Short mmCIF file of all heavy atoms in Angstrom, two decimals:
data_model
loop_
_atom_site.label_atom_id
_atom_site.label_comp_id
_atom_site.label_asym_id
_atom_site.label_seq_id
_atom_site.Cartn_x
_atom_site.Cartn_y
_atom_site.Cartn_z
N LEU A 49 11.98 21.26 -4.50
CA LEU A 49 11.97 19.86 -4.93
C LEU A 49 11.07 19.66 -6.14
O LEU A 49 11.43 18.94 -7.07
CB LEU A 49 11.53 18.97 -3.77
CG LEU A 49 12.57 18.90 -2.64
CD1 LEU A 49 12.08 18.02 -1.51
CD2 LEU A 49 13.91 18.42 -3.18
N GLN A 122 4.86 18.59 19.56
CA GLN A 122 5.12 19.79 20.33
C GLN A 122 4.87 19.56 21.82
O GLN A 122 3.92 18.87 22.20
CB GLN A 122 4.27 20.96 19.83
CG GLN A 122 4.78 21.56 18.54
CD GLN A 122 4.09 22.86 18.19
OE1 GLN A 122 3.70 23.63 19.07
NE2 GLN A 122 3.91 23.10 16.89
N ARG A 127 9.24 28.17 32.57
CA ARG A 127 10.24 28.59 33.54
C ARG A 127 9.79 28.14 34.93
O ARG A 127 8.93 28.79 35.53
CB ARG A 127 10.43 30.11 33.51
CG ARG A 127 10.92 30.65 32.17
CD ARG A 127 12.43 30.76 32.14
NE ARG A 127 12.95 31.49 33.29
CZ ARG A 127 13.36 32.75 33.27
NH1 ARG A 127 13.31 33.44 32.14
NH2 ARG A 127 13.82 33.32 34.37
N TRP A 138 -5.53 24.96 28.11
CA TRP A 138 -5.29 26.27 27.51
C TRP A 138 -5.88 27.41 28.33
O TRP A 138 -5.30 28.50 28.36
CB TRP A 138 -5.82 26.28 26.08
CG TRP A 138 -4.83 25.70 25.12
CD1 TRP A 138 -4.85 24.45 24.57
CD2 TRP A 138 -3.64 26.33 24.63
NE1 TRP A 138 -3.76 24.27 23.76
CE2 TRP A 138 -3.00 25.41 23.78
CE3 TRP A 138 -3.06 27.59 24.82
CZ2 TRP A 138 -1.81 25.71 23.12
CZ3 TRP A 138 -1.88 27.88 24.16
CH2 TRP A 138 -1.26 26.94 23.32
N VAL A 168 -1.06 26.74 11.04
CA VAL A 168 -1.96 25.65 10.66
C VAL A 168 -1.78 24.47 11.60
O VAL A 168 -2.75 23.78 11.94
CB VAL A 168 -1.72 25.26 9.19
CG1 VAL A 168 -2.59 24.07 8.80
CG2 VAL A 168 -1.99 26.44 8.27
N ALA A 307 -3.97 20.60 27.19
CA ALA A 307 -5.19 20.00 26.68
C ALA A 307 -6.21 21.06 26.30
O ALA A 307 -6.18 22.19 26.79
CB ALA A 307 -5.79 19.06 27.72
N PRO A 313 -5.52 14.08 27.85
CA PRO A 313 -4.45 14.74 27.10
C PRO A 313 -4.94 15.25 25.75
O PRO A 313 -5.99 14.85 25.24
CB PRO A 313 -3.40 13.63 26.92
CG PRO A 313 -3.67 12.67 28.02
CD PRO A 313 -5.16 12.70 28.24
N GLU A 337 19.77 2.19 -0.64
CA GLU A 337 20.78 1.79 0.34
C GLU A 337 21.16 2.96 1.24
O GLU A 337 21.31 2.81 2.46
CB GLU A 337 22.01 1.24 -0.39
CG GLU A 337 23.01 0.52 0.50
CD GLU A 337 24.23 0.05 -0.27
OE1 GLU A 337 24.17 -0.03 -1.51
OE2 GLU A 337 25.25 -0.25 0.38
N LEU A 342 21.07 6.02 6.40
CA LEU A 342 20.82 7.31 7.02
C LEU A 342 19.93 7.19 8.24
O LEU A 342 19.99 8.04 9.14
CB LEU A 342 20.19 8.26 5.99
CG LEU A 342 21.08 8.80 4.87
CD1 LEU A 342 20.23 9.36 3.73
CD2 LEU A 342 22.04 9.85 5.40
#
Side-chain angles (χ1 to χ4, degrees):
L49 291 179
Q122 283 190 34
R127 299 267 309 258
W138 276 102
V168 177
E337 192 182 343
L342 288 163

